[PDB]
Amino acid sequence: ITGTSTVGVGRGVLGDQKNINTTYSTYYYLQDNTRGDGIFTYDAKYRTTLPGSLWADADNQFFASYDAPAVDAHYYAGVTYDYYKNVHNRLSYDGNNAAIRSSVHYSQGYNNAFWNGSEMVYGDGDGQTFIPLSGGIDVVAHELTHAVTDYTAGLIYQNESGAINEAISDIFGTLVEFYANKNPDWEIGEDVYTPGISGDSLRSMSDPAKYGDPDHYSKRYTGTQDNGGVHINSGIINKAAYLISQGGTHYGVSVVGIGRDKLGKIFYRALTQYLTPTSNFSQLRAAAVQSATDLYGSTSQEVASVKQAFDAVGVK
């Protein structure tokens, strides 16, 4: 919409108060003109036609229950924008300040969120397995990262390339969480998963096996469910990313951790410069090793730790 830039206030899914950038033109819209070509949040109104209607509010205050998923989708889309721009010098997901669109209240009781090729989509959860999924900053950044991957490496969403696709979204989803520095962890989805059960998550990067995902190549799933296990075998790469950043000893192989920023630098580089749509795990190792070499030198610790971490999870 054409209008003037304003700042509204409301509460997110977890009941936290936050300011949001809006656009006033009779109504106040969830349209943030301060980031690239804009961040736009829509109401799917419990239906599945997308994107639905640009979110409109009469008084620029967003504290209703119904408002909360929109407030967080909007706000966390902005935090993710800020991460990519400030940390990687990347302007939106296409690198050219593409408008970021999100729809909330998608369908009824929908326990999921996704990037559909064009925009982000968030279910409200059934209230049991999930509460509105835009309440999780790692979920929002995971999904937006699929757009980044789609515009860069273009990893095909199947088999090893798809598990790499998934881990990349888990990796930057988590780095955005740390960036916002609000209860950050190496778990995925903990802020919106199973409100009746504390301490669990969708997946874990630091120990994928805690939810049955493999933490070594030898345990890879080789069936054809989940598109060949993209959300399953992602644990093997998630674990390596974790070790590269935080270090440790896994199945007897020790990894010297080099911290989150260098992890993010190495994986960003690999994603944008070396991975291709059909890259497998082995090719990811090569890409990350060359990225580190590019960045820190062939004889660096950084290179050694990337090698150690991939060794630790069995991928050569």
Q: Which residues are catalytic?
A: 143, 231
Q: Is 230 exposed, middle or buried (0-12, 13-18, 19+ CB in 10 A)?
A: buried
Can the peptide bond before residue 51 be classed as cis, meaning omega within 30 degrees of 0?
yes
d(CA 208, CA 206) in angstroms, rounded, equals 6
Report which DSSP code applies to 155: -
Tell me whether residue 183 is annotated as binding.
yes
- As beta bridge partners, residue 53 has 43
Q: Which is nearer to Cu ion, 171 or 289 (CB)?
A: 171
Shortest separation between residue 298's beta carbon and Ca ion, angstroms:
34
Shortest separation between residue 111's beta carbon and Ca ion, angstroms:
13
Contacted by 169, from Cu ion, Ca ion, none: CB < 5 to 8 Å by type: Cu ion
- As beta bridge partners, residue 24 has 4, 28
What's the number of CA atoms in the CB half-sphere (13 Å) around residue 174? 27
Q: Which is nearer to Ca ion, 193 or 296 (CB)?
A: 193
Contacted by 302, from Cu ion, Ca ion, none: CB < 5 to 8 Å by type: none
d(CA 227, CA 297) in angstroms, rounded, equals 37
Residues that bind Cu ion (CB under 5 A): 169
Q: Which is nearer to Ca ion, 135 or 228 (CB)?
A: 135
Burial 2-16 (b: 16+ CB within 10 A, else e): eeeebebebbbbbee
Contacted by 187, from Cu ion, Ca ion, none: CB < 5 to 8 Å by type: Ca ion
Tell me whether residue 250 is annotated as binding.
no
Shortest separation between residue 171's beta carbon and Ca ion, angstroms:
12
Residue with smallest beta-carbon separation from Cu ion? 169
Residue reference for tokens 């069936």: 223
- As beta bridge partners, residue 101 has 40
Tell me whether residue 185 is annotated as binding.
yes
d(CA 26, CA 4) in angstroms, rounded, equals 10
Q: Which is nearer to Cu ion, 152 or 169 (CB)?
A: 169
Shortest separation between residue 173's beta carbon and Cu ion, angstroms:
9
Contacted by 106, from Ca ion, Cu ion, none: CB < 5 to 8 Å by type: none
Shortest separation between residue 198's beta carbon and Ca ion, angstroms:
6
With H, G, I as helix, E, B as strand and everything else as coil, classify residue 99: coil
Residues that bind Ca ion (CB under 5 A): 57, 59, 61, 138, 177, 183, 185, 187, 193-194, 197, 200
Least Cα distance to 182 among 6, 4, 13, 9 occurs for 13
Residue with smallest beta-carbon separation from Ca ion? 194
Q: Which is nearer to Cu ion, 60 or 227 (CB)?
A: 227
Q: Where on the phi/psi map is residue 213: left (φ > 0), alpha (ψ -120 to 50), or beta?
A: beta
Tell me whether residue 246 is annotated as binding.
no
Residue reference for tokens 């598990």: 163
- Which residues carry a binding-site annotation? 57, 59, 61, 138, 142, 146, 166, 177, 183, 185, 187, 190, 193-194, 197, 200
- Which residues carry a binding-site annotation for Ca(2+)? 57, 59, 61, 138, 177, 183, 185, 187, 190, 193-194, 197, 200
